[PDB]
């Protein structure tokens, strides 16, 4: 049956992407937190 | 924002206190009003968002004194 | 460092203690001295490159503190010291006597 | 080799750099076609190009 993840690149990059993170103060805090943890993947 | 230009009055925080002494956070807002002040030195009306205390300060000190203080303060 | 490739040394520790040879290589703390510390290597033959293969006998690096420079006069193990001449030239010098040679 | 280039003027340094560019192209083509046995030459040509551009930068700055 239909499952929860239905991938779409535009939708992924528009809800979770780098510019979407940088558009908000809270998204920039997400990025600051990911960089402080040292993640090799900042954004999808 | 809800800030008086000439006096600096802005919202205060405080408590609503019930008779049973229950505390709730509340705000105290300034008595802010729009008023067009006549300025002879410029022959014009300038509209300020001002408190009642600021209007009294206009009454005592003059619109010219208050206006030069606002201009020194910045926004004009 | 105090021993460089070319000079004749004598091994003062190890299985070849006593024998002398001339230095071939100094990597950092190891030293290769010809005719000393001979290991037997089982070399698998190679087709592409030019090596043949067999049971070879080659010298192995030993620790540089296991050898000493050989005094040309006294023919005994010696230490090295440095002498800055009046000309400003730095020369190795035998610790026992002091002659500039080696 | 750097003393051989520091005496040269900018006008001939530029032309020598262009010669080195053409040289690099031909080394690359010979490398791809398997005709350059002495493979140490490509690095020395690249570093000669770097030296020429450094000297050109110096002689143009002042």
């Amino acid at each position: 049956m239909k499952r929860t993840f239905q991938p779409s690149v535009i939708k992924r990059k528009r809800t979770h992407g780098f510019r979407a993170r940088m558009a908000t103060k809270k998204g920039r805090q997400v990025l600051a937190r990911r960089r402080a943890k040292g993640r090799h993947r900042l954004t999808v | 924002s809800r800030v008086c230009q000439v006096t600096g009055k802005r919202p205060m925080v405080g408590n609503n206190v019930s008779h049973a002494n229950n505390k709730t956070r509340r705000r105290f807002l300034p008595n802010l009003h729009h008023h067009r002040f006549w300025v002879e030195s410029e022959n014009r009306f300038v509209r300020l968002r001002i408190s009642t205390k600021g209007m009294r300060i206009i009454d005592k000190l003059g619109i010219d004194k208050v206006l030069v203080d606002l201009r020194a303060q910045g926004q004009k | 460092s105090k021993l460089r490739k070319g000079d004749t040394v004598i091994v003062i520790a190890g299985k070849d203690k006593g024998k002398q040879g001339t230095v071939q290589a100094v990597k950092n703390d190891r030293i290769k001295v010809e005719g000393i510390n001979i290991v037997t290597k089982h070399q698998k033959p190679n087709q592409a490159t030019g090596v043949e293969g067999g049971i070879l006998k080659q010298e192995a690096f030993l620790h540089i503190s296991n050898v000493a420079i050989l005094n040309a006069q006294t023919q005994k193990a010696d230490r090295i010291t440095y002498q800055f001449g009046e000309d400003g030239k730095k020369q190795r010098v035998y610790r026992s006597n002091g002659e500039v040679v080696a | 080799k750097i003393s051989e280039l520091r005496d040269k003027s900018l006008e001939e340094l530029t032309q020598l750099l262009d010669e080195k560019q053409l040289d690099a192209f031909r080394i690359r083509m010979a490398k791809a076609t398997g005709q350059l046995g002495n493979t140490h030459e490509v690095r020395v040509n690249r570093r000669a190009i770097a030296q020429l551009q450094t000297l050109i930068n110096e002689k143009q700055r002042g």
Binding site: - | - | - | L17, D18, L22, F25, R28, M29, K31, T33
Partner: protein, 88 residues
């Protein structure tokens, strides 16, 4: 400028497709700089091979392959190649 055209051609392509393209149509296959246009490839070919005329340049980007070596997963560089048609 005449120093950018020396970097356009990174080297020829030697393969069966390249060999038979050369035999049948006399067309040269080059690995070219990742940023070279068809006009740049045309100018570079005509300058580095004196006496030839370019009719057509066909370009394509080929993605590099993933080749896990030892313990690591790594990938080869992408590259661009040009099919260059020359005057017969």
């Amino acid at each position: 400028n005449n120093a950018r055209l020396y970097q356009v051609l990174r080297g020829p392509v030697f393969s069966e497709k390249s060999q038979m393209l050369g035999d049948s149509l006399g067309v040269q296959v080059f690995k070219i700089d990742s940023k070279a246009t068809k006009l740049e490839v045309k100018k570079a070919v005509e300058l580095m091979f004196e006496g030839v005329e370019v009719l057509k340049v066909n370009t394509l980007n080929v993605k590099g392959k993933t080749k896990r070596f030892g313990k690591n997963i790594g990938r080869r560089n992408d590259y661009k190649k040009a099919y260059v048609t020359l005057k017969a």
